[PDB]
Amino acid sequence: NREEKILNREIGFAIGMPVCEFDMVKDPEVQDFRRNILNVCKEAVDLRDLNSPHSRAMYVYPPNVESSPELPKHIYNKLDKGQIIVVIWVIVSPNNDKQKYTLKINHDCVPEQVIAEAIRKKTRSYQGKYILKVCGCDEYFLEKYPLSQYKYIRSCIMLGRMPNLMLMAKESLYSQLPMDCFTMPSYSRKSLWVINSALRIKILCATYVNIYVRTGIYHGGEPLCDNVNTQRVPCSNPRWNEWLNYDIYIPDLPRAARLCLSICSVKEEHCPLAWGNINLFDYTDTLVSGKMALNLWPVPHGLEDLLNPIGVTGSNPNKETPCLELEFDWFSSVVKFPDMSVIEEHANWSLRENDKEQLKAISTRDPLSEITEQEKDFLWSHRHYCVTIPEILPKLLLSVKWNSRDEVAQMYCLVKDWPPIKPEQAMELLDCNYPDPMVRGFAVRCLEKYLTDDKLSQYLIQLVQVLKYEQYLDNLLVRFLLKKALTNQRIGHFFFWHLKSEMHNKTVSQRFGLLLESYCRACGMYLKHLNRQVEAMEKLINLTDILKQEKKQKVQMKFLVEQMRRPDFMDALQGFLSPLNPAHQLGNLRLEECRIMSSAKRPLWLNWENPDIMSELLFQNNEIIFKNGDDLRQDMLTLQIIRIMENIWQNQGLDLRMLPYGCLSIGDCVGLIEVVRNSHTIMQIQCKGFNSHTLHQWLKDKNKGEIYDAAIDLFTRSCAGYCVATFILGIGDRHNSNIMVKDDGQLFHIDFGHFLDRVPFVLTQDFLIVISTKTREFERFQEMCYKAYLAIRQHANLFINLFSMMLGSGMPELQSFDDIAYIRKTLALDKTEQEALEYFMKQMNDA
Ligand SMILES: C[C@H]1COCCN1c1nc(-c2cnc(N)cc2C(F)F)nc(N2CCOCC2)n1
Known about the structure:
By secondary structure, the protein is of the alpha+beta class. It is 42% helix and 17% strand.
């Protein structure tokens, strides 16, 4: 049909590749994913039309609210008698005159009540037919949340800024919601446990090799047996035809058992050449058998062993690569993995205060710590009691002998009834260590029960990353994330961008491609907007490309203006939403304000006019830095962890104002960076006005009177935070231009080159002089840094988990758990609270 064709062209433009290539993929699991994945879209759409227009508006404009409505102590103290002042605006008449009505109401009031008292104040000079909007952006207070719980409101309370809201008619916004229609695509309409034996695979011959074959059977990151090398053979004729046998009985193969193979070379000095992984069981629970042609992959940078089991699974798309032919045993009938029922029949067929405390002490340990064999057998012999302390489940999982059908089954049964655990702990079971399907299933259930959309968005990038660790295209995690993204555009955005940014990586081109297809096919009119965005970025990447090649600094600016002035460019880079925050409208380019940043890598400084009716109450211009050339993933993770830390200190009662500015990777070493209005570098303050005593003076001039004190406070608190943080994360070398301060005293860092590889933030005499060595102010400062350090050491588990999940991404500074152990060093996990305290005190003495 017509709608089908158009939708296909647009989806092709958004994903980057045309849909018609997915069709030509003669692969059962691919087609069955593209089809079977559709009832998730159905569920989401049904949820969208369930309450009709209100449900739609909620789908497009979800409430940006904190996780818990409760407010910390100091935050509540910011309120005058537990109340808040709020300015509600109204546009009226043909001239759209703006009239303001100020109010003082309880911070726990519902937006409906705010509208009530607002109309009351408007008449003293009509029921709930109105909704509240944020003056200057596209945020709406559509749900009956307490106003203070909205991120915008709580922020306004902490910063001391007064909220400016706009009263809008419900029908004026509903009239803006398009009538979407999800059209179904045109592409929608045995022995088991008996096999007794040992695993043996035959390698036949290799092609495209102009050395031996090392192989192994692994369960995630652990080999279910010993690796076996095939007979060394001359490189000219790649013909082994050999039969390798493994010390693993066929029934004893876990559900997620994988074959990991590679081709090593011989000078003595061994070096891999091409790697590949195969699922012993397919997506229909069948067991591999017969011949199979597997196209291998080149080796990633920084490889330790002659095997890459953590690498993606499947046959290389580029068939013009080393292709290995394998031969699996074929038995009487098509063998399947037993049903959970038979697992229960074989499962059923197959204690002192001292150790009662020992188990607790074990569960208290962090994930990085290793578990000894005696401790593994210990936890296993105590597998039933470990159910009362559910947070020990990960370590318990690590104690199972996954090469024994018995233990595997009994563990399955222990999972079918295991108590749910908190999300932060549930994600721990979603990294590469836990590849089992029922384990990841349990974790996904936990996330479905206790994960707030706030926390989901906060932990989105990691989840999208652990997608790569899934054994099959169609799984529970992908369906959960996809439904959440098809019911919450605030999540669907960074879902689509986290996915698209890696469409250049052929390791996951297929997966993320199909997923992105199913998403774009059911996301609604927003697809259009995304396309516009994808075009804008497109154009940008072109220009920067021509800037870093043909005209690779004043001439660069001239050329840039001329290319930018072309109408194609003007249209394609005007009137679209900010990929950093889709609530931000970006209208006409203010070219007179755009420029090349003249620092390194030719950063592009872009300035747009804010088209919002009330753009003046937020910012009349939105400035962003398009950078093409520098990998932004590391910066994304760093800023994320900074926001999380800030939320921890706030939820703990110490106001250390951090600044986790935006930062979104949208492709291969391309991305956007949020501009912090009114900020300058240390070196810039030192310049205007070798010298190290004019920072305090500059701040004093920029903050005269009763403001002075306030300013100081900020610069202190923030500073302390950015100190502690930078010490724990081991951020790269800081200097006078890596650091920045705002005209109000806010201090924050930028450009986190490399982390986890030592006191980087050696507070210079500037900062110290700004805080007051022997002064009560410095004492309060030290107390702050100590408190913060403790607060973070109390979530070392969370952070370590986050990194362990981010391993899947090919970031250089994060290639193995060895890189993560650094945090285990700086946090003093193996020591006690006091021991770690002395550790941080002494570490901070080393000026
Ligand atoms: C715009 C400001 C204020 O808002 C916060 C962001 N800021 C900022 N970020 C960066 C940056 C950080 N991280 C990266 N991975 C890459 C970059 C890239 F832009 F180079 N660089 C700069 N430079 C501009 C002034 O001259 C020298 C420094 N400024």
